[PDB]
Structure formats: C-alpha cells, structure tokens
Structure 1
C-alpha cells in the first residue's frame, strides 16, 4: 500500500494527481516509472526533489500549483527521464539545464516568450515539442522571440507546436525530420517559397487562424489589415509530397490556387472552415487536384447578409473520388434541391454529409437515395418543418465528437433531424428516404399523438431518439409500426406528463418483440390512464429517472404497485431521482426477479428493506448512493449470495455491523465513502477486492488501531484515495 500516490501496473504508474501535495513526495515506490503529479500545490522543484527515483521515464507536473519555481538542472540527474510535461505553470522561461534524455517535452500554457539555445539545442533527443498557447488573445505577454537556428540541432524532431503565440513568420532553420508542424494562430501573414521547401517528410501542416475571419468570433480576433486573406506563395508547398493533413481554417481565403496541391498526391484531410469560399465552392479548380481526399471541411463559409435559395456546388466535386466525409455547416441557404447534389452522387465512398446550421427550410429528401452509400445524413439545427476556455489538446474550430451517437449509428443508415421544427409528422414526411436504422428527432417541438402510421415509410428504424419534445401520449398503437425497434429514447417529454387531466397512455411498449432499451427519464411521470403497468417480454433496460415514483407508489394508492413487473426480461433498472422517501415492500417485491442491476441513487431513502434482496437471486449491483440511509443490516449474507458491488456513498451510515466485510462471499466492491463512520470495529472484520472509505469522519485515537492491522493484513483490497481517508484533524488515517 503506497502513499500518498496510488500505484498500478500497465510499465509502473504512480497516479499522484490532485492530492493537495505541497511538495514532491519522498515516499514513492522504487519500481515507479511514470509519476503523474499534476493538479497539486507544488511550488518549488530542486535537484533533491527526485533524489532517488530512477527509471522514472515520465513526469507530469501540469497545473502546479492548483507559479512553479524550478532550479536549473533540477531534473538533470534523472538519466532516464524521457517525457516531461509542465503545462499550465506560469513558467517565465524554458527551464535551464534540462536532462538531454528527453524525447517529449510539453510547455503549453506557460509564459515563455523566448525560445533559446540555452534551453533547447542541447536536447538532441526531442521527438515532440509542445510550446503552444503561451502568448495569445488579450493575455499580457510578449512577442515570441525565437533565437535563430535553435531547432536545426534537433535532427530527431518529428512534431513541433508553436500555435497560439505571436511569431509573425515561419521560423527558418527547421530540421527536415519534422512530420507535423503546428503554426495556428501565430499571426503570420505571408508564407514564402523558402518557408517549408526543405521539409520533405511533413504529413501535417496547420496554418489555421492566420489572417482570421473575425466576424462573430468567440475569442478576441485580430484581422489582417483590410480583412485580407493569408498570402501563400505559389511554390510554398512544392516539395511537400508527403502532406496528409492541411488545415487552413480561418485564414480569410477567397481564392484557392489549384496548383498549391500539384505535388501532394496523398492529401487526405483538408480543413477550409471559416473562410470566404462560396465562390470557390461553386467553381473551384482546386477540387480537380485531390483524387485521394477523404475528408473536406468547408464549414462556416457563409457570406454575411446573404441567404441564397440554393447551395451552389461545382461540378468539380464529382472528381473527389476517395471523398468520405463532406462538411458544409454554416453555408446558409434555404433549399436543398435534387439537382444541387448531382456532383456528389457518383462518389463511391461518400458516407457522411454534414449540413448542420444552414437554416435550411426545405429538403427534397428523395435526393439522398440517388447517392451511393450514405451512412450519416446529418441535418441537425436547421428549419425543416412539417482553466481554461479552450482546451489546448483538441481541435479549435470544431467539436471532434461523432455527429451521431455511435450506438445509434452502429445499427445502419442514419438521419439526424434533431433541432429542427418538425412539430408534426405528416403522412408523407419520410417518403423516399433510404432504409433508415438510426433516427434523431430530438428537439423539434413535437406535440403530436403518435398513432402507429407516422413511421410507415421507414419501418425498419432500430434506434429512435425522440428526446426533448412534448409528445402527447394519447394512442396505444404509437410507434408500433416499427416492428424492429430495439432502442427508444423518450427523455425530456414532460410537458403533457406533468398535467394530471390530460391522458397518458404507455401501453404500446408491449408490442415490440425486439425492444432492448427504453429511456423514460425526466418525464415527471406520476399518473397513467387506464393501464398502470409497463409490459414487455423483450425489454432488457428501463431508465425511469427523473419521474415521480414517490407519487406513483404513494402508500394510499395501489394502482401502480406492479408498474414494472410485466417487464419479464429486465436486467437493468434506473429508479434514480424519483424523490423516494421509502419504497413499500410489496412494490419492491414486484420488481422483476430477472434484475441484475438496480439503481435507486439520488432519492431520499431513510430506510431500505434488505430482507427483500432474497427474492432477487440474480442481482449483482445495488446502487443506493445519495440517499439518507441511517443503518445497514447485520445479516446481508443471509439475503444474498449474488451481490458483487454495493454502492452506499453519500448516506448517513455511522456503524458497520459484525462480519460485514468477511461474510458476503460474492461481494467484491463496497463503497461506503462519504458517510458518517467514526470507526470500524475489529468485530466487523475477504472476498473483497475494493473498499471505499474516503469522506468519513474517522475518529483517530487508540481505538482506530485494530482496522489498520486489517489493512496491512489484506493488500488485495484496493482502498482508493487514501489521502482523503482522513481523521476528523486532517491527517490521513495511514499516518
């Protein structure tokens, strides 16, 4: 048992993050290799901080403290130190006399404005150097002075990142080992012919945000004089036969010179977001130069004040033969006509069209059929009708998450129409579409009574998202045309559920032979009409959080006592956030005997009838976190032989009953963190692999001794975050 860090073996990692450590710990294990020490209160670092920690081949001192004084060659005597990370430390300078064994260095988010030979040129083994985000936006900081030639000694340098600094030009004397060159938001107007001419290995070049398009910028944005475009010499990308990824986002471009790509036969990803390329899109020769392009991002190229009827796509798109994804958000146009996308329809691997945020009013949906294999049709957010703000380690111009949830997209062809205005699905709404498997109609202000016919044209939908609408559930055949339905997400439709005098019919649930997952969360359900029960022979997982079981299962009311019992296959049930003070025993007994996993967290339970766990012989996880439980049973082993994980954090448990750890033979994980345990008696003292105790007011006196021994006896019981397992006054119990 280590302290204050928590170790593992991936290759031996001392996770020592966030522990409020005030200086590097003396007490680290001697087989430790990677020591993560971020987010601590470390203020000073000397040579004698890592005195005897050898074969540390990684250090992380990010965010210290939560500015860091590092003496010169304080790391020098670590002859194995390879990866060093000292991001976000208000470092004034690249620290002096670093150990030349370093292969990866990260100085992101400091105050370093001077890149000197005295810090960098000795370090011949740098592969990846991260200096981004040191002088940017309206930060008080100085122009970035780069001593001449200071990189040419770094002949094993593969990745260099200087983004979000004021450079003004591409440094000269760049080693030709570079494969990845990041110069975004560096205030560079002009790209000369000599600028990259000897970088024959570059796979990636990022010149984004130089001469930026600043209208409506969510950050302080300085245009180039006259909102002028970036100036790229005609032979600037000569000799760059190995480029794969080119990012020219936000460089105010209006013209693309087709000859820029003459010597890039492999170009794979092109990013031209936030430029002014509406003209280039309609008639663009540069598109005939890219037969291996896979991803083209042309988002936010809208003309301010301009709302064209149709989008205008050059015939030249037809030539983009390897194109996989095409992103055209923020073009802004009223209508998508069948003719408008002819140039894309013969492209064989075009699987993703992104038309998000174009305020489109009508789509002639039949057009998506005439394509080859579209997989993701992304139309969200249109107008179709019946420390620190910016993360230095992600992409700055867009979100990188997938457009459509993987779990939904994995079923097949996907149509995301979320955040539109289809407030009512008419009879011909889905005429002429391909066989959609994944459908998002979230947030379309839909208030209709679904009745069994609305989806007849796409009857093979397998995952359906109708979250965040206002469905009026007043017809028992709703959605039953979707015989293949497997996932149905009905969250955040509380509008009509909340009104007691409108009708609520959920009977339809039973008709689905293949329904696996049903989410009814945040619907404020407390009254149903005519039928009180949920029935399905298939359903595996019901999410019923953010409803009102406190009302449903009121003591004076019997109507909903078997609400969930007809769910004969159910293995996971989420009853969290139901305002439950107590569950009547009979209603608890009528939960499906099939359950393996039951969540009743974040209610207000004062009591739990443990005895009833006898009728749930398959149950593996019981989650009661965030209630008001006062007492644990003394006889748990008598009610279950199945429970593997029991979660009880954020309750009011002050005493552990006899044999509680030893006697339950299937139980491996027990979470008692953040309760009211003053102690743990020797009488409470085996099949347990993890026990959580942080957050408790452990009275530290001579009485607390017995348990310590037990910890020493059982190393096989991980006890996390021992630093937070604390005497009630501050020291850990392990002192």
Structure 2
C-alpha cells in the first residue's frame, strides 16, 4: 500500500487479502485500493451513497461489508443501478444498518450470502428474489420491531422462497411476521422465525422440510411478566397453538428452540418423528406442571441439551422441586438447566431420576431461592463437571452493529475454575459461616466459588478439612480476618487462592494481618488478593516456595513503603519462585530506594499501571536481571532513562501508555538490541532525533505505537517523516490517530501522508 489507512492482511496459502477499515470515519472510499483484495471492510462511516465506479477496477473482491453505515445520521443510503454486476467473483455481501426500503437489484449471480438486517424492508416479492436464485444464506431479520418500528405487518407473497433451491439458512427475527412464508424450500437447513408475532402454526407449514436441522420459534406469545423489554402478550394469554402432527416431516432436526412461548403442555406427539433431536429449549414458559409429568421426555433418547429455565408460576412458592421419573430416559443428556424453578427446600430424593445419567456433566440449579439444601447429597454426582449453587439463598445447616457470525448459539461463560475439574459454584449464597461438617463427603471437589457470600469468619486452618483434593478456592467479596497465619493450612493440594474484595477487615488499623500464611501452602501457584486496600501487615515478609503469580492491585502500598519505614522494603524478597507482579493502582507517588533490591530474583512481569509515579528511577533496574515486561502505563513519569541498555539488559516489553513525556534522550535506544516491544502513545512528545532511534534497533522491533500524541510536523523532523513512510515497523493507527499539531495549516495532517 501507499496511503491506505486500513490494515492489510495477506494469506498466501488461502490466496485471500483482508482490508479492515473499521471505525475510520471515512466520508468516501479512499483511493489506491489494490485490485487483488478479497475481503473489504466498510463498516460505520459517513458514506453518503454507493457508486458503480467504487468497484469498477475491483474484480477479485469476494466479500463486501456495509454493516451499520447509517444508524437511525443523514438520509438513507441510495444504491445506483448495476453497482454490483461487475463483481463476478463476489460470494458474500453484507448490507446491515443501511435503512434500505427495497431489496437492491443487479446483484451478481455468484452471490451466496446476503444480509439485510436493521433495514426498512417490510415487503417480500418474488420479482426481487428472482435474481437471488443462487443465494445460500439470507438474513432479513430485525426489519420491524420495538427498536426499529415500521407500523406495517410483514407481508410475503405466496411461494416467494420456493424458487430459491440453493437456500440453506433463512432468518426473519424481529420482523413482525404473523404467518410463516409458505412454502419454504425443501433444501432449507436452518430456520430462524423467532421473536415474531406468529399466533398459529399450520399442519402443512413444515410439510416439505426434510433437511431442516435448526428451528427457532421464540417470541411467539411470549411471557411478558417482569419483562425488561417491550412486548405484546397474546389474547387471553393463549399459548402458541402448535398441532400434534406438526414436526412429522422433520427427520434431521437437531436443535429446537421454544423459549418464551408461554406453553402449558408438551404433547409427546411433537417428538414422535424427530428421534435425532440434540438441543431442546423450553425456557420462559408455564411448564411448571409439565415438569412434574414430563411425558414427552420418553421420546428423546439422543437429547444433549435441555433447557427449562424460568418456568415459575405467578404468586406460587413451591415447597420443593417436583422432578418427574421420566428424566432417567435422557441417557445422552449432558447439560440440564432448571433455573427459575423457585422452591423452598431441596432434598436428595428429588434428584433420584438424575442419578442414573452417566453422561450428565453440567447441572444448573441457580436462581431458585433454595433455603434448605444438604451439601452431602451431591456425593453421588462425582461424574458431574459443573454444579450450580448460584445466587439462591442456600444457608448452612442448623442444629448488533458489530459481530459477523449473526445467528450463533449462546456461548456458556467459561469460568477459570471449570478447567480444574469438579466445580461447586456457591457464589452469592446465604452462607455467613463455614463448618467442616457441611462440606463433608465432598473430597472430590476440585473447585469452590464463594464470591459475594459476605462471610465474616476468622479461619485458623480447620474449616475446609474435607476439601483435601481442592485446588482452586474463591473467597471474593467476603470479610476475611487474617488474624492467624495458619489459614488455609489444611488445603494441601490448593493451587490458586482468591481473597480479593476483602477490604472490610484490611481497612482497619492496629489489628494483626498475617501476610505470611502462604508458607504453609506448598503447591500454591497463583494468589489473587487485589482490591483489598491493605495498609498494614504484622508479618514483615511473605514466604512462599512455589508462588509464581501474585496480584496486589488496588491496595495501599504507599503507607507500607513510607519514607523512613524500611520494615516492609523486602516484602517480596522471600518469594523465590515469583515471576509476575501486579502492584498497580496503589497511589504510589514515588518509589523509595531499596525496593528493587528486595524484589524477587526471578521477577519477570512487573506492572505499575495507574500508580501516579511522580519520579521513577531507572538506574536501580540493574538489580532485576530477569525483568522483561515492565509496565508503567497511566503514570506521571516525566524523564526517560539516559541509556536503557545500561539500565536493564533483558527488558523487551517496556510500556509507557497514557504518560506525560515531552522529549526523549539522545541515546534512549542505544545498543538496546534486546528490546522487542515499545509503547509511547498518548504522550506529549515533540520530536525524535536520529541518534535516539537507530535503524538497527528498530529493525527487530515487533510492534511500536506512537499514536494519539502531540507530535509536531515541522521542518526539524524530516528524518522522522522519511522514516515513517519508508519502514516496515508495524505502527497501528499510523494515519488515523496520530496527527500533526502544527504549524498553522498542518493541523490534523497525517504523518505518513506528508511530503
């Protein structure tokens, strides 16, 4: 490229060239676009319209994106006739967020994907779809709904999609559709008619559909109780009328969604023919009485995922969960969700149908306000991977502008504690104190989350006695009193400990704070105690023979390292195996001398972000012989080191983002062959001399940032002007963020576009 402000990606193996112009505020398409490009990104900008001459010389383009070019902004985008006939190699085209009134014409016959979401097209005719006979995926959803109203019901002519023999995916979500557009082509695989106003389903609606795999019917007669979004309930709260002989022709169906349908009964005739169903969704319905029967579960032997979340009755508080005995027929069931089934007490015998599920891995029972729940009843679920004990009140026992995948399945929140094995997420529960008898018969638990429980306890090394094999423990948003150094001593196999958000007891001054409790932890690897506001510590030093990562952000290290107080200088000296430090946001105005001498010898990741370092010394960096990722972002530094080579011999990831540096030394990067990453963006730098930025050092630099700063473009930086437009150093936002302060008419000028 010559002056292209967009990133260019080259794939020789795939023979694809990617140009990304996302968030560039380009009024018009820039010139000099290579003809060998394949994917073109033309997202949110100030483009007035589309001209045929825009792609006149581009014949190898295979993907054009026009997502959200005008979010309801000037008038709607107008497309000239024959503006796409010259792209014979076009295969995919996106036109979302263009406020189009009708489907554009003149599309090439080689097109396979077409997106028209967030538009004003409420009429479908076969004349406009005749040219799309070779299309495969069609996206016409979000055309008329609460966010983008049109006051016109969706109208589709008869057999509009019948001629589309190559159609495979069709989406009509949030389009105010009342009647299914019969007749859909027999080659359809995925159907997305959810979030519509369909009230009845005909027996011949899916008569010719035999290769369908995904069917969505959400939003039809939805449950509007406690709905945070606008919705229109059906008359008399009638459920979605679906005939018994509806899913008869479907044989390859795998995913069926019926979320938010206000269903009351599920006849077994629906699943008589679909014997290959994998994922079934029935959330936000009135199937509370159907769960007690669950007669339809006998016809789903290959079901993988079953969803029955939020099926609670109005003004009804069940005494206990009513699980039908038919749940044992789900041999292949893996993930089960019974959320929103609010009940008082959970007993062991209520989970008997799930005892024989060998393939069951995840059992979701959160948001149920369970009061009494014996934790010893989970000893039979050793094969279970994730057990949900969420925000419910279980107490201890007494005495679309972005994205490109469009229609995609929901991705479960992959917590960091799931990869360690069995997980008992007891977060945000009503537990206020921990007993060893409560966690009995739970030696197989490899994870335990207790965030938000607000437990006020002074552990001395006996609470988690049965948790012999526990490796990950979370105690965030609690009140832990570190009055004894024997805490977590019985956790012999513990690896990661989280005691963050425990500022309540740590804010008080004068009480004992045993910070050397990590000595007993022989195999501890990571310790997260950030956001604790620790201001005092009884223990002089912290000892750990295996700790590698330590987080100490959002604390008070200024009082610990106050002038004249050298007691806590070598706080991290005994951490021989420590490699990563995260001491940030500690309000450290300055670093007293001697802290670097007390730093761990094996330190490799040091961060000091948002610390407000008024003056940071650099000659003391020679003590750290293994520092490689020193971070000083969002700081108040004002002087760069005279020679970085003499300071550190292994630093390669120095970052000074959001700093205030006006000038650099004449030998800042002299003989610094070990540097790999350099960041100086968001600064007040004025100029860079040749003797400070040698070409030999810059040749091996992987990434350098000099954007969003106050660089002046005058005659004294001719060397820099020549270098920025003749080097191979990857400088992001080279022609989008970094501008010229002056002088005069040179305001906002591009450095790479200066001659």
TM-score, normalised to structure 2's length?
A: 0.93
Asked if the contact 1:662/1:687 (under 8 Å) is kept, the reply is: no
Q: Distance in 1 between matches of 2:403 and 2:84?
A: 30
Question: 1:315: which partner in 2?
Answer: 325
Matches for 1:410-425 after TM superposition, within 5 Å:
410-425=419-434
Question: 1:5: which partner in 2?
Answer: 6
CA drift of 1:394 comes to 7.0
Q: Verify: 1:619 aligned to 2:627, yes or no.
A: yes
Q: Verify: 1:427 aligned to 2:432, yes or no.
A: no
Relative to structure 1, is the Cα distance of residues 322 and 526 closer, same or farther in structure 2, using a 3 angstrom cutoff?
same
Q: Distance in 2 between matches of 1:476 and 1:287?
A: 54
Question: 2:696: which partner in 1?
Answer: none
Question: 2:98: which partner in 1?
Answer: 89
CA drift of 1:56 comes to 1.6
Q: Distance in 1 between matches of 2:719 and 2:129?
A: 55
Alignment counterpart, residue 648 of structure 1, candidates 645, 651, 656: 656
1:364-408 deviation per Cα after TM superposition (whole angstroms, max 9, x unaligned): 222222236111111111001127899994779xx6333x61x31
CA drift of 1:731 comes to 2.3
Relative to structure 1, is the Cα distance of residues 94 and 660 closer, same or farther in structure 2, using a 3 angstrom cutoff?
farther
Matches for 1:427-506 after TM superposition, within 5 Å:
427-433=436-442, 435-506=444-515
Q: Alignment partner of 1:367: what SS?
A: helix
Q: Which moved more, 1:245-254 or 1:430-439?
A: 430-439
Asked if the contact 1:727/1:733 (under 8 Å) is kept, the reply is: yes
Relative to structure 1, is the Cα distance of residues 139 and 238 closer, same or farther in structure 2, using a 3 angstrom cutoff?
same
Question: 2:558: which partner in 1?
Answer: 550
Alignment counterpart, residue 47 of structure 1, candidates 49, 52, 60: 52
Alignment counterpart, residue 516 of structure 1, candidates 509, 515, 525: 525
Question: 1:356: which partner in 2?
Answer: 366
Relative to structure 1, is the Cα distance of residues 313 and 390 closer, same or farther in structure 2, using a 3 angstrom cutoff?
farther
CA drift of 1:339 comes to 0.7
Relative to structure 1, is the Cα distance of residues 605 and 69 closer, same or farther in structure 2, using a 3 angstrom cutoff?
farther
CA drift of 1:623 comes to 1.2
CA drift of 1:322 comes to 0.5
1:547-573 deviation per Cα after TM superposition (whole angstroms, max 9, x unaligned): 111221111322211111111111111
Relative to structure 1, is the Cα distance of residues 372 and 573 closer, same or farther in structure 2, using a 3 angstrom cutoff?
closer
1:643-677 deviation per Cα after TM superposition (whole angstroms, max 9, x unaligned): 22111110011113235456311212211111011
- Superposition CA RMSD, Å: 2.0
Q: Alignment partner of 2:18: what SS?
A: strand
Q: Which moved more, 1:291-300 or 1:141-150?
A: 141-150
Q: Verify: 1:400 aligned to 2:408, yes or no.
A: no
Asked if the contact 1:348/1:372 (under 8 Å) is kept, the reply is: no
CA drift of 1:280 comes to 1.0
Relative to structure 1, is the Cα distance of residues 389 and 682 closer, same or farther in structure 2, using a 3 angstrom cutoff?
closer
Relative to structure 1, is the Cα distance of residues 52 and 169 closer, same or farther in structure 2, using a 3 angstrom cutoff?
same
Q: Distance in 2 between matches of 1:661 and 1:709?
A: 19
Q: Distance in 2 between matches of 1:178 and 1:452?
A: 62
Q: Verify: 1:188 aligned to 2:201, yes or no.
A: no
Relative to structure 1, is the Cα distance of residues 111 and 203 closer, same or farther in structure 2, using a 3 angstrom cutoff?
same
Question: 1:60: which partner in 2?
Answer: 65
Q: Which moved more, 1:515-524 or 1:602-611?
A: 602-611
Relative to structure 1, is the Cα distance of residues 659 and 98 closer, same or farther in structure 2, using a 3 angstrom cutoff?
farther
Q: Which moved more, 1:703-712 or 1:626-635?
A: 703-712
Q: Alignment partner of 1:415: what SS?
A: strand
Asked if the contact 2:8/2:19 (under 8 Å) is kept, the reply is: yes
CA drift of 1:177 comes to 1.4
Alignment counterpart, residue 669 of structure 1, candidates 656, 661, 677: 677
Q: Distance in 2 between matches of 1:511 and 1:720?
A: 50
Asked if the contact 1:72/1:98 (under 8 Å) is kept, the reply is: no
> Any gaps of 5 or more consecutive residues in structure 1?
none
Question: 1:732: which partner in 2?
Answer: 750
Relative to structure 1, is the Cα distance of residues 623 and 119 closer, same or farther in structure 2, using a 3 angstrom cutoff?
farther
Paired residues, number = 730
Q: Alignment partner of 2:336: what SS?
A: strand
1:431-488 deviation per Cα after TM superposition (whole angstroms, max 9, x unaligned): 1225100110110011111111111111211011111111122121111111111111
CA drift of 1:187 comes to 0.6
1:697-719 deviation per Cα after TM superposition (whole angstroms, max 9, x unaligned): 12112223211222344214444
Asked if the contact 2:643/2:670 (under 8 Å) is kept, the reply is: no
